[PDB]
Amino acid sequence: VDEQPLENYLDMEYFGTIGIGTPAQDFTVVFDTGSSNLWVPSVYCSSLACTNHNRFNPEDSSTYQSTSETVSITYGTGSMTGILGYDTVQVGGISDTNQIFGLSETEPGSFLYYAPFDGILGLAYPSISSSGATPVFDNIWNQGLVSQDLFSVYLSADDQSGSVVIFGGIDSSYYTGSLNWVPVTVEGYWQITVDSITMNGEAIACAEGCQAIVDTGTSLLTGPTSPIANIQSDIGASENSDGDMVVSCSAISSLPDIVFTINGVQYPVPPSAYILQSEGSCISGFQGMNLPTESGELWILGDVFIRQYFTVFDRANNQVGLAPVA
Numbered sequence: 001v002d003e004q005p006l007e008n009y010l011d012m013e014y015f016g017t018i019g020i021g022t023p024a025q026d027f028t029v030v031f032d033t034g035s036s037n038l039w040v041p042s043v044y045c046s047s048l049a050c051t052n053h054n055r056f057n058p059e060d061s062s063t064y065q066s067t068s069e070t071v072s073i074t075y076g077t078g079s080m081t082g083i084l085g086y087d088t089v090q091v092g093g094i095s096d097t098n099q100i101f102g103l104s105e106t107e108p109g110s111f112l113y114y115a116p117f118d119g120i121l122g123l124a125y126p127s128i129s130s131s132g133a134t135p136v137f138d139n140i141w142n143q144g145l146v147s148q149d150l151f152s153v154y155l156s157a158d159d160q161s162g163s164v165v166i167f168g169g170i171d172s173s174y175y176t177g178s179l180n181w182v183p184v185t186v187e188g189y190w191q192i193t194v195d196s197i198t199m200n201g202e203a204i205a206c207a208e209g210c211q212a213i214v215d216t217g218t219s220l221l222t223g224p225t226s227p228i229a230n231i232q233s234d235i236g237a238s239e240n241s242d243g244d245m246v247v248s249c250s251a252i253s254s255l256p257d258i259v260f261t262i263n264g265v266q267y268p269v270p271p272s273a274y275i276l277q278s279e280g281s282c283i284s285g286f287q288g289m290n291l292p293t294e295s296g297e298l299w300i301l302g303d304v305f306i307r308q309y310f311t312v313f314d315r316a317n318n319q320v321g322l323a324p325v326a
């Protein structure tokens, strides 16, 4: 029953409306499985990005509780500092009482200024949460507000309406077949093993396995810079004059699927998904980024992947469920 509709912005970002405070002040937030903190802009913020986004006003809420603690969060794209406070967060028809969240003080740079969302609602594990702030979903579960300690995500394609986050439930209308269950390797991000990445029965990357995260907040398929450089040559991407990694739109019809094998099951990504149409030209859905951790350099299975596969995030059993979208 507890669905939260998400707006699809150019197949790059997905965000939904939440209410904070009594009475509710409305904000748009990216529902991000790559991070664990909830924050919104506030009146304490004087950064450029704070001036053109909705700002939380503590004085207007009858249920706001202040702390003396701060938070500092750095993302791949964007960063914030803020102060932690407690209030009621309305999300997915759930009144999430006594929720700790960040009230931004600084949001430096161009990225957050141009972004259509106000904040981020992190959906990963408490262990990666800045200042050890209780994530939203952990607080919902701890208060017995859902019955099933899971949430599932359907992300629409080609700017269509219909993207949803389902709290404490699955909807089998969104997928075909049955869910394939994959164990989380490390409890931080929603981290899994990718057995191999193949094209025409040949391993193009991750020949003996690699570590990947299932990240709703990342647009593209990202990996370490050297394996990605190989994937770019394999799909005929050339580096254009303006910074982009471009492919001829004509070529989509002749390229093979890139197959991600996960727990001995094949998950093909077609060239109509991994080659993106952005602003007249066609671009590679692969991005080179080095994200070093103690399990290796991480791959990100971003929105390119998730659009193809309905994704269930099971906290009861520490597993990810995958099935092809209907």
Ligand SMILES: COC(=O)[C@H](C)NC(=O)[C@H](C)NC(=O)[C@H](Cc1ccccc1)OP(=O)(O)[C@H](CC(C)C)NC(=O)[C@@H](NC(=O)[C@@H](NC(=O)CC(C)C)C(C)C)C(C)C
Residues within 6 Å of the ligand: 012, 013, 030, 032, 033, 034, 035, 036, 073, 074, 075, 076, 077, 078, 120, 128, 189, 213, 215, 216, 217, 218, 219, 220, 291, 298
């Ligand atoms: C504890 O460890 C850490 O603290 C490190 C410093 N940071 C993190 O873990 C933080 C919380 N998470 C993170 O930083 C993780 C990635 C990550 C995963 C493991 C280790 C390192 C990074 O990214 P998120 O998904 O939360 C973020 C959400 C955005 C802002 C809406 N997305 C990102 O920052 C990614 N940005 C995007 O994909 C943006 N789009 C693009 O840049 C694509 C462009 C339009 C071609 C978004 C507008 C969709 C980049 C990674 C490309």
